[PDB]
Amino acid sequence: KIITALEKGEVEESEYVVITVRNEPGSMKFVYKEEHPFEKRRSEGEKIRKKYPDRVPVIVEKAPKARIGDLDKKKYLVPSDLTVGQFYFLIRKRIHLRAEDALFFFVNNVIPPTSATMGQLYQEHHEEDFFLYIAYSDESVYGL
Amino acid sequence: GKIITALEKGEVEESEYVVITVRNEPGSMKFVYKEEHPFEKRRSEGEKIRKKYPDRVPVIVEKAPKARIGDLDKKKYLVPSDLTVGQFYFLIRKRIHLRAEDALFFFVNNVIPPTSATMGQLYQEHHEEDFFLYIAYSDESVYGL
């Protein structure tokens, strides 16, 4: 029910125990999950897991009420050892966002730790269709 | 200690407050986290961690003086705002390896916080000037015994 990660601070570099709670409440629905039924998504995910074992399949979509640029393609294969912060910056560059513009990631309504690898995120939060679902917004709470 | 009274006009409603201030009766709670790191470092780190993970609050947990209770391995936590104080109580209970009949008491400013509240509410109401929330824990109900 509770998972923990460890992350050094950027200013005071001792390690935080970053607590994450499973099954958090949120309001977001994914248009990928509405345009494709479960079994179709699962077949696609299984085949892409067989083709690319070194990478995890991630769906990235804009959050409700978020005023921020659109993302052209929403399906990504990310190397397991790429950290969540690196993929964060990749998505920042793909949305063509100024360095001072805010971007927040949500995995089951929880901002993931920047220290973690995409492999860890996938292992801990991939759905039954073998996809990892990330939402993004410009504010810390979407749907507002 | 000392109990002082002053007078101060209000900002919006300009009648006068009788401002009571307590010089060490009770006194401030002391944390070794505040002793191993200077203020500017703690405050800048707290600002950065609130900007990085706004859905969580940064908490320092340390054992209280004279407390006869297990030690705590890690002392710096990032706690989801919507986690209730009792849930965090349970998390720390598990980290200390505590039996079902053993007491665990939290203290924020020498006061046992409300168990019903969320950690976000506690932080909003009691975070210090370094953007950290300081919780002490003990086996007795009064801080210092």
3-state SS, one letter per residue, for A47-80: HHHHHCCCEEEEEEEECCCCCCCCCCCCEEEEEC
Distances (CA, A) of B92 to A21, A109, B32, B53, B77: 15, 24, 18, 21, 11
Instruction: Identify the bridge partners of residue B123 per DSSP, sorted by sequence position.
Output: none
A16 to chain B, closest Cα gap in Å: 5
Residue type, B46: G
Distance of alpha carbon A60 from alpha carbon A64, whole angstroms: 13
Distance of alpha carbon A47 from alpha carbon A24, whole angstroms: 29
Cα B136 from chain centre: 7
Domains of chain A, by residue range, sit at 2-137
A19, B56: Cβ pair inside 8 Å? yes
Nearest to A111 among B55, B74, B82 (CB): B55
A124 phi, psi to nearest 5 deg: -95, -15
Q: Does A115 touch chain B (CB under 8 A)?
A: no
- CATH label, B2-138, candidates 3.10.20.90, 3.40.190.80, 1.10.10.10, 3.40.50.2300: 3.10.20.90
A7 contacts in chain B (CB < 8 Å) = 78
Closest by CA to B131, choosing from B42, B55, B54, B56, is: B42
B52, A10: Cβ pair inside 8 Å? yes
Instruction: Identify the bridge partners of residue B108 per DSSP, sorted by sequence position.
Output: B111
A104 contacts in chain B (CB < 8 Å) = 54
Q: Does B120 touch chain A (CB under 8 A)?
A: no
- CATH label, A2-137, candidates 3.30.565.10, 3.10.20.90, 3.30.70.20, 3.30.70.870: 3.10.20.90
Nearest to A12 among B42, B82, B83 (CB): B42
A5 to chain B, closest Cα gap in Å: 10
Residue of chain A whose alpha carbon sits nearest to that of B54 = A140
Three-point CA angle B120, A83, B91, nearest 5°: 35
Q: A86: part of which helix (H) or strand (E)?
A: helix A84-94
B76, A15: Cβ pair inside 8 Å? yes
Residue type, A117: T
CA dihedral A124, A129, A131, A132 (to 10 degrees): -40
Q: What's this structure's resolution in Å?
A: 3.0
**Coil, strand or helix at B16:** strand
Closest by CA to A7, choosing from A117, A94, A99, A103, is: A117
Please answer whether residues B13 and B37 qualify as being in contact, where contact means their C-beta atoms are separated by less than 8 angstroms. Answer: no
Q: b or e along A55-92 (b: 16 or more beta carbons within 10 Å of the residue's beta carbon)?
A: bbbbbbbbbeebebeeeeeeebebeeeebbeebbeebe
Token representation of residue A9 = 């601070």
Beta strands in B66-104 (DSSP E): 76-80
Distance of alpha carbon A19 from alpha carbon B79, whole angstroms: 5
Residue type, A94: R
Distance of alpha carbon B7 from alpha carbon B9, whole angstroms: 7
Closest by CA to B33, choosing from B23, B24, B46, is: B46
Crossing angle for the helix pair A84-94 and A118-125, to the nearest 10 degrees: 100
- Which method resolved this structure? X-ray
Diameter over CA atoms, chain B: 54
Distance of alpha carbon B57 from alpha carbon A138, whole angstroms: 20
Q: B102: part of which helix (H) or strand (E)?
A: none
A16, B48: Cβ pair inside 8 Å? no
Using a CB cutoff of 8 Å and minimum separation of 24, what contacts does A39-46 make?
Answer: A41/A129, A41/A131, A42/A128, A42/A129, A42/A130, A44/A129, A45/A129, A45/A130, A45/A131, A46/A130
Using a CB cutoff of 8 Å and minimum separation of 24, what contacts does A45-49 make?
Answer: A45/A129, A45/A130, A45/A131, A46/A130, A48/A77, A48/A130, A49/A130
Closest by CA to B56, choosing from A112, A65, A137, A9, is: A112
Please answer whether residues A84 and A91 qualify as being in contact, where contact means their C-beta atoms are separated by less than 8 angstroms. Answer: no
**Coil, strand or helix at B75:** coil
Nearest to B54 among A10, A12, A140 (CB): A140
Q: Which residue has the tokens 């824990």?
A: B137
Round to the nearest angstrom and report the end-to-end CA distance of chain A: 27
Q: Does A141 touch chain B (CB under 8 A)?
A: yes
Distance of alpha carbon A78 from alpha carbon A108, whole angstroms: 19
Q: Does A17 touch chain B (CB under 8 A)?
A: yes
Token representation of residue A1 = 């029910």
Q: B92: part of which helix (H) or strand (E)?
A: helix B85-95
Token representation of residue A100 = 């001072």
Q: Does A19 touch chain B (CB under 8 A)?
A: yes
